[PDB]
Paper text:
IL18 is a pro-inflammatory cytokine belonging to the interleukin 1 superfamily and plays an important role in both innate and acquired immune responses by inducing interferon-γ (IFN-γ) production from T lymphocytes and macrophages while also enhancing the cytotoxicity of natural killer cells. Mammals and poxviruses encode homologous inhibitory proteins of IL18, named IL18BPs, which regulate IL18 activity and, in the case of the viral proteins, contribute to virulence. To understand the mechanism by which yatapoxvirus IL18BPs neutralize IL18, we solved the high-resolution crystal structure of the Yaba-Like Disease Virus (YLDV) IL18BP:IL18 complex.
We found that the use of an IL18 mutant [IL18 (8S), see Materials and Methods], containing substitutions of the four-cysteines with serines and substitutions of four surface residues opposite to the IL18BP binding interface with alanines, greatly improved crystal quality and reproducibility. The crystal structure of IL18 (8S) in complex with YLDV-IL18BP was determined to 2.7 Å. It involves extensive hydrophobic interactions in the center (I29, H30, V31, P32 and V33 from βA, the aliphatic side chain of E122, V124 from βH and I129 from H3) flanked by hydrogen bonding and charge-charge interactions, burying approximately 1,700 Å2 and 1,465 Å2 solvent accessible surface area (ASA) for the wild-type complex and the triple-cysteine mutant complex, respectively. Indeed, a non-reducing SDS-PAGE showed that YLDV-IL18BP proteins expressed in E. coli or in mammalian cells formed disulfide-bonded dimers. The dimer interface is quite large (about 1,700 Å2) and involves extensive hydrophobic interactions in addition to the intermolecular disulfide bond, indicating that the YLDV-IL18BP dimer is intrinsically stable in solution.
Author numbering:
A (entry chain C): 19 to 133
B (entry chain D): 1 to 32, 45 to 140, 144 to 156
C (entry chain A): 20 to 134
D (entry chain B): 1 to 32, 41 to 155
Write the structure that this text describes.
């Protein structure tokens, strides 16, 4: 049966801050061989691009096999030693496939305070 | 910024199903063989940044330098510190035809990989709606 | 050199989809006697719910403790979401030989955060 | 509501290190391998969370479950059930750690609040019984559980 064609990106956030904060970005693309997710900090900076020991850490899962009707890539963003800068920083995950990039972004402060 | 990620053994064909390949003179051509598409992450996301290299023992990497098609003796690099590169192409799907791909140059916007006949030769070239000559299929494992 | 931590946390999706998953994770140094689970609204375990209500609980087991803590997990899974479910008080509980630890959440309140 | 979750093979001792066990008359006692010695603590989830709701059953037994019914200690012929539809039960105990002593556990009855499992000497017997707490640090209501 023809697999159904989904393209999605989503972030799972913690409802409260801790000393280690992990953000789970998960992708969903039917482009099984050509889809992946990753984080951009603020406006245009991949984690690689950051000053060393800045508190951000990216974990991109690999060897992660695609399922039958989609690839489901994942990239966790990891915050230690949190500064208010980081608390108000715009954090964005991107889905990249042979289609126009999909983004979901978030500001932690706004969430921890949306209560 | 371009960050190298995952890489795929790939066979590329034009819309007449001619297989892309390299002869002994390092000419990219189409006949009736195996390449490595490497995906990169982008600080300024505009599509799927990829490199095209020959799955050889050799170092061979497709380049759109000076608006011509070449193979630079080099491997796709771990990172590129620029917004564009002569070896980086955006791999985008043909609208309405998700099984079809186009390859726009990053350094020369509006320019795409294309299959062109010559005299008795189908050669891969660089070229400035619906042009089937800039459409390809990519096959994977 | 074991440090003594007791915690419970929920990871929520920043936007609704057709399948919504909530990740409740526990942290207790009571390696052999700690677990997490969900209570829907006021006093209802998922087991206690009308069948096909949209809630589904997945409690991870065979999930071995680490050296200095047990890290149990229970995922709450929402399909066919109704406004009721969107405003329902969802709570995860850590249970160990100490007073239970709770973190709760209302999805609407989180998704309805604009900035 | 109680929901049965996991279960653990366990050895229970009083603070004199006497091993809990069952004789041939089904009497829970303490002494100093054996099928009788091993127990299964089964954890339960709670609609009204107040601690770690557990049942205590004999491992090597068809159906032998500890009960605090009528404020006495017994073994009912039954297995710990998949769910209990009440806020309290004669076979449900809250397993709480002794303050300052995380390696020590107390078992308060759910049906009879303020009543705990205890080791009591009677002649040359050490029996398992149910008793009130009153003042604290009563070492008689403290146990070690192994695995």
């Amino acid at each position: 049966m023809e697999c159904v064609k989904t393209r999605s990106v989503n972030i799972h956030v913690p409802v409260k801050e801790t000393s280690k904060v992990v953000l789970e970005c998960r992708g969903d693309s039917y482009f099984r061989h050509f889809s992946y997710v990753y984080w951009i900090i603020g406006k245009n900076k991949t984690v690689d691009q950051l000053p060393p020991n800045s508190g951000y850490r990216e974990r991109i899962y690999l060897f992660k096999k695609p399922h039958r009707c989609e690839n489901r890539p994942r990239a966790d963003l990891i915050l230690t030693n949190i500064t208010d800068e980081m608390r108000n920083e715009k954090l964005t995950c991107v889905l990249i496939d042979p289609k126009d990039p999909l983004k979901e972004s978030v500001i932690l402060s706004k969430i921890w305070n949306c209560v | 910024y371009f960050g190298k990620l995952e890489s795929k053994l790939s066979v590329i064909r034009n819309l007449n199903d001619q297989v892309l390949f390299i002869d002994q003179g390092n000419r990219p051509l189409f006949e009736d063989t195996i390449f490595i598409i490497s995906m990169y992450k982008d600080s300024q996301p505009r599509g799927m940044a990829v490199t095209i290299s020959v799955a050889s023992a050799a170092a061979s990497t497709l380049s759109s330098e000076n608006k011509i098609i070449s193979f630079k003796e080099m491997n796709p690099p771990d990172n590129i510190k620029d917004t564009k590169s002569d070896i980086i192409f955006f791999q985008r799907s043909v609208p309405g035809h998700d099984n079809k791909m186009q390859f726009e140059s990053s350094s020369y916007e509006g320019y795409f990989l294309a299959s062109e006949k010559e005299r008795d030769l189908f050669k891969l070239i660089l070229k400035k709606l619906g042009d089937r000559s800039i459409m390809f299929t990519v096959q994977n494992e």
